[PDB]
Every structure is written in C-alpha cells, then in structure tokens.
Structure 1
Amino acid sequence: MNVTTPEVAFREYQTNCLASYISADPDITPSNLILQGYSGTGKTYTLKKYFNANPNLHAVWLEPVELVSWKPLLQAIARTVQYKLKTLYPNIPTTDYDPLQVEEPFLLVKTLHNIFVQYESLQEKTCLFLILDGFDSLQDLDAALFNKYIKLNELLPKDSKINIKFIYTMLETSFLQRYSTHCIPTVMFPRYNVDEVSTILVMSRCGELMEDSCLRKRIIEEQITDCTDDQFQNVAANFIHLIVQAFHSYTGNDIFALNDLIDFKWPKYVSRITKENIFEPLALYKSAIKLFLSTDDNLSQTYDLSIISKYLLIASYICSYLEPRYDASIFSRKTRIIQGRAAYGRRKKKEVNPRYLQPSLFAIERLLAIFQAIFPIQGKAESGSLSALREESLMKANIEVFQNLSELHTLKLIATTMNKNIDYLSPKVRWKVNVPWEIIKEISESVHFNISDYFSDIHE
C-alpha cells in the first residue's frame, strides 16, 4: 500500500497482516479487527512497533483493564478521542463536550456524532484507530458487550471526515469463538517456542544486565579488570540460556515468569564469579549450582494460635475426614461398669485417601467430643484421695473453648454452609475445616500430637 512494515523478530506473519488491515485510507480498512493471543505472546509489542514505524496514521491507546466497568469504558472513549483530535488539529475551533456526560451506549454515539461534525472542514477522509488493548481483561465482562462495539460503525455517520476504527486485543479464545459468525478479521498470536522465548529474552534483558550495578560493581572491586563488552554480553547471555534451560519446565513458554526468575537469581549469580569464572562458563555453573535446582518463588510454628485453638483444628480435621461411624472404636478408653460391646472399627481399608477429597460436614457436638478425647490431661493427680475426686481430670467446654472456636471461624479456618446470615445457634448449621493437610501436619507436630496415626490406619 503506502505503509511501512517493521521487523518484529518472531512475528513476521503477524506484522504483514497487521500492515494489511491497518492503513490511512478509510475505504480499505475494516471497522473491526481482533488481535488474539494469550499472555506474553508479543501482541502489544508488535502493535506498538507497527504504529511507531508509521507515524502519520493516528492511534488512541486505551487499556480496558484499568477501566473496570462498561460505563468508565464509554467515558474514556469520549475523553481520549476529543483529547487526541485537539492535539492533532489545533486550528479547528471546537467546544469541549463533557466525557462524564455519557452514561449510555447511545450517548457515546450522540457525543461522537457531535465531536465529528465540527471537524467537517478537513481536506480528506481520515481514520482514527481506537485501540482497546485488552478488551477481554475487563472485569465485569459479559457476552453482550463486544457485539455492542462491533456495531458502533453503523450508527456513526458514513460520510464523516473522521471514521473511528476499532482494534481489539483479547486473550482467551473462548471469548472469541462467541463472535465467530460476525466474520470480522482476526490475527492470531500463538505462543512462542522454547527457542523463541530464549532469543526474545536475550535481546530484551542483556542490556539491563550490564547496566545493573551488581555486575558493574563486582568486576572492578574484585580486582579482575580483564574483560570487554563482548565478554560482558556473553556472560549475561549464557546466564539467560542457563536460566531458561533449568526452569523452562516450571514456567513453560512464559516471558514474565522468566523475567522474574532472572532478576531474582542474577544478584545471586554475580556474587559467585571470580577470575576462573568469567572466561569458562562450565566452571561458573558448578560454582552456582544451588540456584539452578530450586526456584524459591516464596516470600517456629505456622500459626500463633492458642494451645486449645491448636487442638480444635486437629479435632476439626478428624471430624471432617474420619467417618462418624468409627469414632467409638478409636477414641474410647474408659472401663465399663455396665455390659456392652465396643465398636469394632473399620473392617477393610478404603483406597480413596479422603484427605485428597473435599472435607465433609460435621456437627458442633461431635467436634467437642473429639476435642476432649484428644486434649492432654489437665489437673494431674497429686496422689491425694482428698484431691482426686474434685479434680475432673478431663477438660470440659468452658467459655474459652467456644470463644476460640468462634475466633477460628472468623479467621476462615473453620467453614460452614454458605447462607447469608447463618446463625451459629441453630440445629441445621454444620461445620467443616478448611486447612490443607500440610498445615494440620505442622500443627500436630507443635503439640506433639501424632495425627498421622489416625490416618495411617485408613489407607496410608
């Protein structure tokens, strides 16, 4: 045409289609265009690099992720279109329309109709590209909003001098397949290879890894001043090829997860270089082996709970994964004055391992029964017949057991069935724990309680 195609690295098909649909002449440009790709696939990179290589065709860049609802999205369109045209044509006399006055999808059309008729003295047809960059990332999004922006071209005047053009950017391809019968052109941005991620990450980050002060400071301060830029570039490039080849299987074909694992592990990789480490790359990798094996993407006891709050999550974890039918066989200890048979226990093991499954609901009285079954002995016997009757060696539910059970519920460590204004004080309300096994195992080793023996006999 009359347009310039930039050289984006691994997007050479996508840029030729992007130069095919976007042009200055409004007759040969579609009024809608989707650039679909997933995250990190380089579709705001080459969209930006296309418009920088073509300065005489005009663009309005909007991010629909920082606008959250449909109504600020309409208001930002009315604000940034007229603010673009004031910088773009200062010689045109205009009266500013309040962008906060649009409250409807039609009041946008009426406002854009009023903005565009006062630029009618222009010399030729001109298209302004309204780039909705991340339209699918709008939080309140529904199915009936994107086909409300497809059809704005038909409600705006056909012989205006300014023809607004929509360029959409979206992610998830189930949103895009809802609008397949509109037959509006789409350029797909597929995920990169492992070789395409590494080449992009090495041309994006070798500049910053030189101007980083940590590599800058050490080489003069270690008193090994025998290096050039071509070794400086090759020592940072070989780190990136080594930080990908270790952690590609963890991240995948991301760009933003690789960019975090570089700068979390580049200050730790610089501080292990000396004279034998710049020149030979294999020797430096064995001297920095402990930061290429573990990711460490994380930032006494896990909880500072009370000593009876700590046994009341344990009893919550028992009630919600052991079954109520087998509790008399496990916890009963006391001698029988009156004849009766104890519970026999589970006859055969289950191979489901219920701790994998979602926790089941229990009643409030079963929790308080298993609580005093497992709580340690309070008021220990002091070898006195005068003292042994009064002691009540087993713990009853005082005001603190219920206060700590209610505190354990406000901390979202015990759950209920979800109804708005549940009442604690009701027969129907049942309870369940929501902590994982890895938390209740850390809890049980603090109070020296062996919770694993209660679950070893069921399958493990």
Structure 2
Amino acid sequence: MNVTTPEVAFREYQTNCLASYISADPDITPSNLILQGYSGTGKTYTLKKYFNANPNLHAVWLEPVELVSWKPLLQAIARTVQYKLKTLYPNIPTTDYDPLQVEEPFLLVKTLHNIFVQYESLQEKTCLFLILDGFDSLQDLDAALFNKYIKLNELLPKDSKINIKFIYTMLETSFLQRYSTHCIPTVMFPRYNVDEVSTILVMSRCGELMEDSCLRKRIIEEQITDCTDDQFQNVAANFIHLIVQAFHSYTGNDIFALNDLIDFKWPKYVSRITKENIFEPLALYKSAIKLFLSTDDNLSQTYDLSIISKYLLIASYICSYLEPRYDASIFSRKTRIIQGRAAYGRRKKKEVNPRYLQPSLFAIERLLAIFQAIFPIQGKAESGSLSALREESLMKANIEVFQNLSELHTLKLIATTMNKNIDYLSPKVRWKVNVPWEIIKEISESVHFNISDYFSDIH
C-alpha cells in the first residue's frame, strides 16, 4: 500500500519499520505491537507525525498518565470507541450504550460485541488503532496487566466488520524484559547524542524562541537599527552552542531540562546583548558566563522565627553526631569542688567525619542538658548584695520550650520513629533529626553562634 513516508531527520529507521508494519489493510499488520523508547526522544511526537503523513488511517488517543487504575481505562475506552464510531459514521443508526456501564474487561468486550453486531452492515472490514501513552507510568501498576490487554483480539469474534489494535510506550525496559517470551514486534529509539540533540533543538525551539517577545523587547531597548533574521538566528544558534557546551556534562542528551533552563535564563542573557556584544559574541558570553558557571536556579536571610526554635535545633544536630562520652571535656564550665577525675577525651582521631554517616538515636534529657549548657547568656546581674543572691541566671524547663518543641515535630524537622498512632510520650521512644549540615550551618553565622570548631578537628 502507498504510504507517504515522513522524511524525519533522525528517526528514519523506526519510520521504515512502522511504515512497513502498518497500512490500511489489517491483513499486513501484526496482531500486537509495541513502540518503546525513552523520554525526550519524541516517540509520541513521531507517532502523530506519521499519522499526519498518513491521514486516511485513524486512531484513538488515551493518556493513562492521569488515570490511576484499570477501571478508569475501561470507562475511557468504552466512551471513546463508540464516540469515534458514531462521529466517523454519521449516517449509521445506533443505540448508544453508557460508557460508565463498563466495570470489567468482560463487560467491555460485551459492549464492544454489541457495538459490532449493531455495526454488522458495513461494506468493508476496517481495523482501528488504540493508543495508551505511558502504560508503565501508572500509579498502582502490578505485573498482571499487559498480557490481558494483549488478549483482546482473541476473545473477539473473527467475523467483526470492525476490529481494533493496540499501541504502547515504556521507559524503563525492566518490565519489558520481564515479559518478552511472547515474541512481540517492537521498535526502539536509542537516547540521542550531542550533535543529534543539538540539531533537534535548533530545529524545534529555534522558531519558538525566535518569535518570543524578549527579542523585540531588547531590539528597541537598545535602539540599534542594524539587524536581520539571519543574524538573529546566528546569535541564538551560538548562544545555544554555548548552553550545550556548558551544561552537556550536567545532563547530556536530554531536552526537557535544557528547555526549562533556557526559559529561565534566556531573559538575563538578552538583557546583556548589545551592538558590541553582537559584533563580537565572545565578550558577550564572558559577560553572561555567570549563569553558565552557576545555575543557581532556586530561591540574605532564611527565617523569621523565634530564638529558642533557632537555638534548640542547633543542639540536636550535636546530640546525634557526637559520641555521648567524648563531650564532657568541651561541654563543662563548672569549677570542681569535691574529689573526682575527668576523662581523657578522644585519644584517637576519627577519619570518617560522621557528617557522611546516618545519625544516631538519643533521649530527650540529653537535649535538655546540652541546650542548658549552650544557651546564650540572659538574666543580667549586677554583682550587688542581693542581685545574684536569688536571680538564678540560667534558663530552666519552662512551658514555652515544650510547646515550641512540639511544634517542630509537626514542622517535621525533628523526626521520631515514623509511626501511625504516634505517641510523643513513651519511655521507649527514640528521636532523631532530618536536616543536612547546611541547614544547621545557616543558623550559626546568622545568630552569631559558633559550633563548627566541634566538628572541624576530628577529621
């Protein structure tokens, strides 16, 4: 059958494969076939490109990326099949069944059989195509699904004036190798390379970012009447060359992240281009090298909280990365009175820097003690005859610390043994924290506290 080939730039192998696989007559098409690939390769884009190349053939489209289970696919398919049938055969009579009536593949095949028997008076046999984009991307997927969908053409009677076909698309290929014994035809799209992705981008996003507003914005913000579409395309092309030369090591052969980053960082580069910068783009790149050297694509201060919240979270990081016995030397300030000896501390240096380690457990009284020790100074005294006689200048176990600590657990910064039916009160509960080193570091200099010396000496 005459099939117009889509003259694609990079997927002509799969184009040939599928153009040979599929045509109008169902006799020369396989019973079941798969079209697997990886994200960014435009497998879905090329499917519709081939459909554009072949208008007479038609197919239904479903996106189970949004659907969650099997029955939603059942209802969607039951709706779409008859919707397409009646839309593409206006003159045919019908008794439209309820698509919601389906709740099981048995019911689905029953209603399709009803559809076919009411469509028994067709002039020639016709096979349609079905599409399930991301069938492995389901959210409650199990391993007993694909074979059942493969088994649709069997239970169908062979005298059907209207038949159907299946299409698929996977990402991992692990579940694909989990089921390959049935010898299914398959076409694959390998992940692209440097020049392939570069050309793909400079022919896909070229127009999109050429007809963007920011170009015209800058062209009259600079007010320079020396331009042409050729030079616009050249400057965009070399800027994309710079983008890829900078961030190929970061990602490699992907398009989605590159497009997102381009959308984020294009305006800053456009805000810098000028006459001298277009006449000599190396200096322009030197002037916009900062985003290339640092993406910094997120968002002085970091908090607007109280003081004890800031200062108590500081203690917990210490109480799970420091040995319980190697702390009495540095965390004591009283003057001894009665006879007694201290320890020798850490005789042996550690070479692992427990920053790299999963933290330990502890009881809360440890936190109480260490926080009492490290708390800043308050309750100013005067050295008077009675000033310090009763002041007791040191924070004690009030209620506010209890409440702000209880707040932290709902803030999910202090982590306890994960439990449904949690119980903050128990003798046996262990506690921990979920914060990296940077979270704790950001507090230190902001509040003018210093604990880096406790960690910087061991390793």
Which TM bucket (shorter chain)?
over 0.9
Listed one character per residue, the Cα deviations across residues 220-250 of structure 1 (whole Å, up to 9, x for unaligned) are 4533222222222222222222211111111
Give the 3 Å change call, closer, same or farther, for CA 367–232 of structure 1 in structure 2. same
CA distance in 2, matches of 1:343, 1:156: 83
Listed one character per residue, the Cα deviations across residues 34-85 of structure 1 (whole Å, up to 9, x for unaligned) are 2211210121111110111111111111111011222212211111111111
Listed one character per residue, the Cα deviations across residues 388-409 of structure 1 (whole Å, up to 9, x for unaligned) are 1312222212101111111111
Gaps of 5+ in 1: none
Deviation at 1:284, TM superposition (A): 2.8
Q: Count residues with an aligned counterpart.
A: 459
CA distance in 1, matches of 2:283, 2:419: 62
CA distance in 1, matches of 2:325, 2:110: 70
Deviates more, 1:195-204 or 1:356-365: 356-365
CA distance in 1, matches of 2:424, 2:274: 65
Deviation at 1:187, TM superposition (A): 1.1
State the SS of the aligned residue for 1:415: strand
Deviation at 1:166, TM superposition (A): 0.6
Deviation at 1:219, TM superposition (A): 2.4
Deviates more, 1:152-161 or 1:220-229: 220-229
State the SS of the aligned residue for 1:424: coil
Give the 3 Å change call, closer, same or farther, for CA 16–112 of structure 1 in structure 2. same
Give the 3 Å change call, closer, same or farther, for CA 333–277 of structure 1 in structure 2. closer
Q: Is the 8 A contact 1:444 1:450 kept in 2?
A: yes
TM-score, with length taken from structure 1: 0.95
Deviation at 1:325, TM superposition (A): 2.5
Deviation at 1:377, TM superposition (A): 2.0
Q: Is the 8 A contact 1:36 1:188 kept in 2?
A: yes
Q: Does 1:333 align with 2:341?
A: no
Give the 3 Å change call, closer, same or farther, for CA 383–220 of structure 1 in structure 2. closer
Give the 3 Å change call, closer, same or farther, for CA 197–318 of structure 1 in structure 2. same
Deviation at 1:304, TM superposition (A): 2.5
Deviates more, 1:363-372 or 1:261-270: 261-270
Match of 1:260?
A: 260
Q: Percent identity?
A: 100
CA distance in 2, matches of 1:209, 1:154: 49
Q: Is the 8 A contact 1:243 1:261 kept in 2?
A: no
Match of 1:216?
A: 216
Deviates more, 1:412-421 or 1:440-449: 440-449
Q: Is the 8 A contact 1:68 1:138 kept in 2?
A: yes
Deviation at 1:447, TM superposition (A): 2.3
Q: Is the 8 A contact 1:70 1:140 kept in 2?
A: no
Listed one character per residue, the Cα deviations across residues 133-153 of structure 1 (whole Å, up to 9, x for unaligned) are 111111111111222211122
What is the aligned-residue RMSD (CA, Å)?
1.7
Listed one character per residue, the Cα deviations across residues 111-146 of structure 1 (whole Å, up to 9, x for unaligned) are 222222222212222111111011111111111122
Q: Is the 8 A contact 1:302 1:439 kept in 2?
A: no
Deviation at 1:292, TM superposition (A): 2.7
Gaps of 5+ in 2: none
Deviation at 1:293, TM superposition (A): 2.1
Deviation at 1:444, TM superposition (A): 1.7
Q: Is the 8 A contact 1:61 1:131 kept in 2?
A: yes
CA distance in 2, matches of 1:424, 1:45: 53
Going by fraction, where is strand more abundant, 1 or 2? 1
CA distance in 2, matches of 1:104, 1:432: 48
TM-score, with length taken from structure 2: 0.95
CA distance in 2, matches of 1:374, 1:30: 75
Q: Is the 8 A contact 1:125 1:161 kept in 2?
A: yes
Q: Is the 8 A contact 1:42 1:189 kept in 2?
A: no
Q: Is the 8 A contact 1:32 1:168 kept in 2?
A: no
State the SS of the aligned residue for 2:117: helix
Listed one character per residue, the Cα deviations across residues 418-446 of structure 1 (whole Å, up to 9, x for unaligned) are 12112111011111011110010001222
State the SS of the aligned residue for 1:93: coil
Q: Is the 8 A contact 1:60 1:131 kept in 2?
A: yes
Deviates more, 1:381-390 or 1:309-318: 381-390
